[PDB]
Amino acid sequence: AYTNSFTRGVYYPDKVFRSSVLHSTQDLFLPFFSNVTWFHANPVLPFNDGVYFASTEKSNIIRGWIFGTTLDSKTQSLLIVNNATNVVIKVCEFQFCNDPFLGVMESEFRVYSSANNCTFEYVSKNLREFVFKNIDGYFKIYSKHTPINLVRDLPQGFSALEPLVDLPIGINITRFQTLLALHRSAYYVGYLQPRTFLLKYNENGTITDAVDCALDPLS
Amino acid sequence: ICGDSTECSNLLLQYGSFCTQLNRALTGIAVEQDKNTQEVFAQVKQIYKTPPIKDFGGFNFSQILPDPSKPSKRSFIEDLLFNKVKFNGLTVLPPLLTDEMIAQYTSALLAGTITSGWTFGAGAALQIPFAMQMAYRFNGIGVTQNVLYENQKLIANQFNSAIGKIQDSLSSALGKLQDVVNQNAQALNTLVKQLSSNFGAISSVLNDILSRLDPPEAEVQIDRLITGRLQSLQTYVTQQLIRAAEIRASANLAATKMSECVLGQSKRVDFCGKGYHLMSFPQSAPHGVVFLHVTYVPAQEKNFTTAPAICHDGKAHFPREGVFVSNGTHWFVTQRNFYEPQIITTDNTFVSGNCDVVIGIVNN
Amino acid sequence: ICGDSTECSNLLLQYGSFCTQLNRALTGIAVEQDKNTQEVFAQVKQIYK
Amino acid sequence: EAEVQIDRLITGRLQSLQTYVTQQLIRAAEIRASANLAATKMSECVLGQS
Amino acid sequence: EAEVQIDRLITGRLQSLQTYVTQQLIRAAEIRASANLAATKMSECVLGQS
Amino acid sequence: ETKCTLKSFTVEKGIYQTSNFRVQPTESIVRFPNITNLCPFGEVFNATRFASVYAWNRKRISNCVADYSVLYNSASFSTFKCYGVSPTKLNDLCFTNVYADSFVIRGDEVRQIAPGQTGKIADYNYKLPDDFTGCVIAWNSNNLDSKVGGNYNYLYRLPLQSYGFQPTNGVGYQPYRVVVLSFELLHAPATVCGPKKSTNLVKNKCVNFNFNGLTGTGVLTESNKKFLPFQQFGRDIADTTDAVRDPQTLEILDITPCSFGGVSVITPGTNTSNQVAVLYQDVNCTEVPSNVFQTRAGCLIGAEHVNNSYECDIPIGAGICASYQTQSIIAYTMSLGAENSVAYSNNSIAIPTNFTISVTTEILPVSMTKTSVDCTMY
Numbered sequence A: 001a002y003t004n005s006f007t008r009g010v011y012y013p014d015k016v017f018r019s020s021v022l023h024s025t026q027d028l029f030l031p032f033f034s035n036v037t038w039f040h041a042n043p044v045l046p047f048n049d050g051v052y053f054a055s056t057e058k059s060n061i062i063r064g065w066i067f068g069t070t071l072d073s074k075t076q077s078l079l080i081v082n083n084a085t086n087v088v089i090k091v092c093e094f095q096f097c098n099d100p101f102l103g104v105m106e107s108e109f110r111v112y113s114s115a116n117n118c119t120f121e122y123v124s125k126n127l128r129e130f131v132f133k134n135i136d137g138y139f140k141i142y143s144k145h146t147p148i149n150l151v152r153d154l155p156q157g158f159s160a161l162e163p164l165v166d167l168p169i170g171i172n173i174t175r176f177q178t179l180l181a182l183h184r185s186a187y188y189v190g191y192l193q194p195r196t197f198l199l200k201y202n203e204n205g206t207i208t209d210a211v212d213c214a215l216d217p218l219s
Numbered sequence B: 001i002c003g004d005s006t007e008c009s010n011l012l013l014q015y016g017s018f019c020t021q022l023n024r025a026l027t028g029i030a031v032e033q034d035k036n037t038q039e040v041f042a043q044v045k046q047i048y049k050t051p052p053i054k055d056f057g058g059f060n061f062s063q064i065l066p067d068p069s070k071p072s073k074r075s076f077i078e079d080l081l082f083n084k085v086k087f088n089g090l091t092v093l094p095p096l097l098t099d100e101m102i103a104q105y106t107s108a109l110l111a112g113t114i115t116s117g118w119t120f121g122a123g124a125a126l127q128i129p130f131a132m133q134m135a136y137r138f139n140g141i142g143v144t145q146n147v148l149y150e151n152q153k154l155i156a157n158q159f160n161s162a163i164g165k166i167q168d169s170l171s172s173a174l175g176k177l178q179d180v181v182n183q184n185a186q187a188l189n190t191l192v193k194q195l196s197s198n199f200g201a202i203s204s205v206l207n208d209i210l211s212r213l214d215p216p217e218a219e220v221q222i223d224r225l226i227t228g229r230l231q232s233l234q235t236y237v238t239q240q241l242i243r244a245a246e247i248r249a250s251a252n253l254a255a256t257k258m259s260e261c262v263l264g265q266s267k268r269v270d271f272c273g274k275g276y277h278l279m280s281f282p283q284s285a286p287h288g289v290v291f292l293h294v295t296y297v298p299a300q301e302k303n304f305t306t307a308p309a310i311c312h313d314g315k316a317h318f319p320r321e322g323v324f325v326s327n328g329t330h331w332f333v334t335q336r337n338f339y340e341p342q343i344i345t346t347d348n349t350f351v352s353g354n355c356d357v358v359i360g361i362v363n364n
Numbered sequence C: 001i002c003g004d005s006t007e008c009s010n011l012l013l014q015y016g017s018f019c020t021q022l023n024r025a026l027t028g029i030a031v032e033q034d035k036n037t038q039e040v041f042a043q044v045k046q047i048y049k
Numbered sequence D, E: 001e002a003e004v005q006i007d008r009l010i011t012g013r014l015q016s017l018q019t020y021v022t023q024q025l026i027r028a029a030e031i032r033a034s035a036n037l038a039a040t041k042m043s044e045c046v047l048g049q050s
Numbered sequence F: 001e002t003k004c005t006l007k008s009f010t011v012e013k014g015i016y017q018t019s020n021f022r023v024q025p026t027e028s029i030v031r032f033p034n035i036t037n038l039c040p041f042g043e044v045f046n047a048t049r050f051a052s053v054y055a056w057n058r059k060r061i062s063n064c065v066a067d068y069s070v071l072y073n074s075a076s077f078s079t080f081k082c083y084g085v086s087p088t089k090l091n092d093l094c095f096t097n098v099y100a101d102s103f104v105i106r107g108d109e110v111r112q113i114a115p116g117q118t119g120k121i122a123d124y125n126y127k128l129p130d131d132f133t134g135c136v137i138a139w140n141s142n143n144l145d146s147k148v149g150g151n152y153n154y155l156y157r158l159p160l161q162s163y164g165f166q167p168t169n170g171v172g173y174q175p176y177r178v179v180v181l182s183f184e185l186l187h188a189p190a191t192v193c194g195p196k197k198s199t200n201l202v203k204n205k206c207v208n209f210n211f212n213g214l215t216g217t218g219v220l221t222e223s224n225k226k227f228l229p230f231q232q233f234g235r236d237i238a239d240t241t242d243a244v245r246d247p248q249t250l251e252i253l254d255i256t257p258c259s260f261g262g263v264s265v266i267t268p269g270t271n272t273s274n275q276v277a278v279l280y281q282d283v284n285c286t287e288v289p290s291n292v293f294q295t296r297a298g299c300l301i302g303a304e305h306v307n308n309s310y311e312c313d314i315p316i317g318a319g320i321c322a323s324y325q326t327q328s329i330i331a332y333t334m335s336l337g338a339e340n341s342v343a344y345s346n347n348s349i350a351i352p353t354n355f356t357i358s359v360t361t362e363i364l365p366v367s368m369t370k371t372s373v374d375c376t377m378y
């Protein structure tokens, strides 16, 4: 299936406070009214320039992503996981199952079978959006958690995404996947292009509205 | 250009006297803005006041006369007009005349004209009753005085009802005043938004070329900024000269209209309204002036048949100040702008010649 | 200025709003030329014959 | 090496365009004062007797 | 190396001259309005009664 | 100062813009993150085995206390060039991330490690961008890397050739070790930087401040902005820094612009008197450094305020004028004219019984001086 975003995937281009100021930016955005894939419950996707990624549930079936160029050994990759404990970022050379996942006893993690040469570690319904990008050896992640009053369909509205993480890795990326918690006892993928937007800033400094300046003559 | 930094300020000395010229230009255009207002509004010697008991023959000037319970003692219509329309090295100087002073000037002009006609613009003000002044103005457009005195209440009702519509149409149009405000703000913003361009340098901040850069090389990156900022300031100063030369001509026209439509009755066509000029009233606005033009417009025409002259006793008669007309069977004289027929006599005609050289003579 | 080339456009982008001002200046002139003609000639309500 | 020369070309070509636009602004204000005189003549010499 | 120093003098003096000429053009247009007004006063105040 | 501005010894009555008042800033605080770990360069500048030239290394120095002085003055370096920033000001700046690249080349190939060069090294082994920011350091290492019989373990891409280094090689063929420091500034909140000393913090005084890199001047004041965990400071339209966040306590502070305006001198003319009054334009009259008088146009010093009203003489502004009358100087709200009620009634008329003949003058410029300039001879 395919679906239509309406006004989705707007993130704060950077720090620096700001108030009521229709500020104009050039960056990598998800164009308004786009053609976003639909997935149910998954396969190896491309990256090619950033990614929008939403998801909907009350349980937690979406348990992180895996990135990289080959998703195996012989080249390095990232791995972002969340068991019922908390997030586990990790950067080694792995050996990934071609269909990697984790179970739910509640024993799991048939994800990889190798953790060699680790160069970075870290340990510690609902709509959960994420924007992933990778520039100059930094892997930036923006995110937002809005509550839907549906269960698993893409809604309409405006909600800007706030920066979360910054990782000075150096890693090359060309592909990525997803991770799901099986049954033993809905998600979308947009892509980002270089656009020019007009963001409206509130008096507290939040982005409340935007204009995509390449949609139509009025814009 | 420099923003309080001695490194940039010493390099700037090498450019001579460009920045004394720019200030001279801006001072020369800030003095003429007060000269512009002085010549439109200070067209009186005395400050005239209107009488407490106001009986002007049925005419009602209450929406244009000053109101004490209002802000700055403005008139009711001067309020609708005033309701409709911190940086680096940039300041705004206040005008010499406040808004209170200019509203005082317009109320003195307006009390002079309601009360003395056009006499105060030629000498001492001499009072005259308002309907007799209205009759003089009707004479000035070629209507007789009995036409005013026999239609006084109707003419006064039409005037009151037409002043009542200005108030609606405005309360519910000042684009020429809004545009000069907008242009000046759009230029001042473009001037400040240029303080954040590189013009081909490593940054836009002098504390970033000065911090991360020796004192012998920075001289190449600071000059890049100096040249750009000088260019931008001088462009700002040229476009202000060109915009002030246009505001000056508008104020020169306003000063002529105040003389010729407010302190007089004009005969020039379409200079003080559309119609036949009777009188004009000034009102102050934020950076300008509104004229309310009162004119006479003829209405409800009929056709008759005409002749140039009348033949009688072998002589040709011409009207002294009218036209010969015929209602189908009889011949009268009217005045040319208002139908009021009279019997043709030897008191309203004159004779010259015999009646075989004019073409179109009729017998009567 | 540039004219086709692309090495020129990125360098000229460094000068700010110099080109936006010039286009505004020329557009105002062109809008004034029609008002000149409207003020001289369209001085009549009806088209008389 | 080329950016240095292209900046000189840009500077000259921008100066030429500013000269052009400033003179068009000064020349249009002269045409406006003439059209204003024409409007007054059309009002006062064609629509009336002066 | 004479050339690199001569070019800065050329650049500065050209800009000086251009500023002078633009401000003369703006001032001549103000003198022309005055002379047109004086011509109109000569016709209407000396050769007639206004 | 007025006589100097006009270039004359006699000034006539008027009002003249003479300069630009300006408050001075006291102190010069310096906020900086805590002090811990001065960075152990003695691993990249003190390695036992460097890295090839075709696969250089890449260490990402991070949050630390970097002391580029121990580098700059070590006198053991044969080449220390800094490009984005002269060397002595390194221990006074802060960036987001420093990268250090390491490798080994010949002796006369150190001139291709620079922005905008060509040659077998800069073409395809290691290329430096054209707006480089860091510094390049290089020192001879003949005794460590060159071994009798030829050290064939140091290759380069030309597909790969090997320097055969030998201890009896003329200079310019002996191995040099190179380290390229590249300071980058993404868009984070802060990072490593020279460890000055830092100091306390004041509030409500023109001051000269440095907030981990942000250098400025002004009055600092407690804020009430609703900054975000990612929003440290908030600039202002037209792009000027207006707010900061204090690194140590993490509170938002506004940055106002020290009181500054213009200064005008009011004189009756040197042919009348040498007294003078002074207008500080739109400055509150309590922060200027007798007669101090507050106007809608600024603070006036040296004129007394009277209650009379005269015709305007020297225009101050907002309805206020000055004159040399009341012997001294004074201010007042100019008068528009004498008042006059007209004896209006509905059957009264005034008719003149005499006349005067008046003659008045009117002066008009017709022409100006015709001048030409030869553009070439000028």
Ligand SMILES: *[C@@H]1O[C@H](CO)[C@@H](O[C@@H]2O[C@H](CO)[C@@H](O)[C@H](O)[C@H]2NC(C)=O)[C@H](O)[C@H]1NC(C)=O
Pocket (backbone or CB within 6 Å): B060, B061, B062, B063
């Ligand atoms: C002149 O016209 C005004 C109307 O603008 C008259 O004043 C108002 O008249 C209405 C009707 O009686 C009252 O409700 C208002 O209170 C009046 N005052 C206002 C609106 O300020 C005024 O009476 C007229 N003058 C004469 C002499 O009739």
Ligand SMILES: *[C@@H]1O[C@H](CO)[C@@H](O[C@@H]2O[C@H](CO)[C@@H](O)[C@H](O)[C@H]2NC(C)=O)[C@H](O)[C@H]1NC(C)=O
Pocket (backbone or CB within 6 Å): B301, B302, B303
């Ligand atoms: C003056 O008389 C003329 C002559 O009839 C009137 O003009 C004609 O009016 C009729 C009806 O409106 C039209 O159909 C004709 O085309 C008009 N023109 C002619 C006949 O040439 C006119 O209405 C009269 N004017 C007044 C004020 O009564």
Ligand SMILES: *[C@@H]1O[C@H](CO)[C@@H](O[C@@H]2O[C@H](CO)[C@@H](O)[C@H](O)[C@H]2NC(C)=O)[C@H](O)[C@H]1NC(C)=O
Pocket (backbone or CB within 6 Å): B327, B328, B329, B330
């Ligand atoms: C033209 O006007 C005259 C008015 O003088 C009309 O003639 C008079 O009309 C009244 C009323 O009809 C009569 O009492 C008079 O006897 C008439 N004659 C005179 C000498 O007054 C005449 O009817 C009008 N003609 C038209 C076509 O309207």
Ligand SMILES: *[C@@H]1O[C@H](CO)[C@@H](O[C@@H]2O[C@H](CO)[C@@H](O)[C@H](O)[C@H]2NC(C)=O)[C@H](O)[C@H]1NC(C)=O
Pocket (backbone or CB within 6 Å): B311, B363
């Ligand atoms: C106007 O009146 C004169 C004099 O009453 C008329 O002149 C006469 O016209 C008739 C007919 O053409 C002649 O027979 C007479 O000899 C004329 N007498 C004189 C003294 O000229 C004249 O015709 C009248 N005009 C009209 C149009 O009827």
Ligand SMILES: *[C@@H]1O[C@H](CO)[C@@H](O[C@@H]2O[C@H](CO)[C@@H](O)[C@H](O)[C@H]2NC(C)=O)[C@H](O)[C@H]1NC(C)=O
Pocket (backbone or CB within 6 Å): F034
């Ligand atoms: C840097 O040092 C300062 C003190 O010099 C530390 O400030 C302390 O912060 C704790 C909060 O956990 C307070 O309970 C202490 O009272 C503070 N001390 C003083 C003297 O104010 C600061 O925490 C240090 N930096 C870091 C990152 O820990």
Ligand SMILES: *[C@@H]1O[C@H](CO)[C@@H](O[C@@H]2O[C@H](CO)[C@@H](O)[C@H](O)[C@H]2NC(C)=O)[C@H](O)[C@H]1NC(C)=O
Pocket (backbone or CB within 6 Å): F041, F042, F045, F046, F070, F071, F074
């Ligand atoms: C690498 O380590 C050596 C040894 O610790 C440092 O060499 C010292 O340099 C200083 C200043 O030149 C001398 O006073 C010492 O005598 C040297 N050490 C010894 C053991 O003699 C060297 O400075 C380090 N390199 C860097 C870049 O820090």
Ligand SMILES: *[C@@H]1O[C@H](CO)[C@@H](O)[C@H](O)[C@H]1NC(C)=O
Pocket (backbone or CB within 6 Å): A002, A003, A004, A034, A035
């Ligand atoms: C998205 O693209 C596919 C490509 O074939 C197309 O079939 C589909 O209709 C598109 N969806 C929308 C909403 O345009």
Ligand SMILES: *[C@@H]1O[C@H](CO)[C@@H](O)[C@H](O)[C@H]1NC(C)=O
Pocket (backbone or CB within 6 Å): A081, A083, A085, A086, A088, A123
């Ligand atoms: C969650 O997964 C991480 C991945 O290595 C692991 O380190 C951690 O121990 C797991 N949680 C528990 C409770 O074992």
Ligand SMILES: *[C@@H]1O[C@H](CO)[C@@H](O)[C@H](O)[C@H]1NC(C)=O
Pocket (backbone or CB within 6 Å): A116, A117
């Ligand atoms: C990465 O792992 C492989 C196999 O474990 C090993 O041969 C290689 O040396 C490792 N990389 C580094 C830089 O040591």
Ligand SMILES: *[C@@H]1O[C@H](CO)[C@@H](O)[C@H](O)[C@H]1NC(C)=O
Pocket (backbone or CB within 6 Å): A170, A171, A172
């Ligand atoms: C990423 O892959 C490209 C393939 O074209 C390669 O040239 C590049 O060096 C890789 N990135 C890094 C940091 O090596």
Ligand SMILES: *[C@@H]1O[C@H](CO)[C@@H](O)[C@H](O)[C@H]1NC(C)=O
Pocket (backbone or CB within 6 Å): A202, A203, A204, F226
């Ligand atoms: C945030 O914005 C709202 C509306 O714009 C305002 O009422 C509020 O005071 C602001 N600050 C908060 C909620 O802290």
Ligand SMILES: *[C@@H]1O[C@H](CO)[C@@H](O)[C@H](O)[C@H]1NC(C)=O
Pocket (backbone or CB within 6 Å): B359, B360
């Ligand atoms: C007017 O024209 C008519 C034609 O219908 C003619 O008979 C008559 O003589 C003319 N009269 C005048 C005064 O021109």
Ligand SMILES: *[C@@H]1O[C@H](CO)[C@@H](O)[C@H](O)[C@H]1NC(C)=O
Pocket (backbone or CB within 6 Å): F271, F272
């Ligand atoms: C200027 O000085 C001369 C001689 O000292 C004097 O005649 C003249 O009145 C003075 N002017 C004024 C305005 O005081």
Ligand SMILES: *[C@@H]1O[C@H](CO)[C@@H](O)[C@H](O)[C@H]1NC(C)=O
Pocket (backbone or CB within 6 Å): F284, F285, F286, F294
């Ligand atoms: C100057 O500051 C004082 C102290 O706050 C204040 O009372 C006064 O009103 C200020 N000046 C003006 C013109 O408001």
Ligand SMILES: *[C@@H]1O[C@H](CO)[C@@H](O)[C@H](O)[C@H]1NC(C)=O
Pocket (backbone or CB within 6 Å): F305, F306, F307
């Ligand atoms: C001016 O008059 C006011 C009247 O309110 C009075 O309060 C004030 O003291 C007077 N000023 C002087 C200097 O006498």
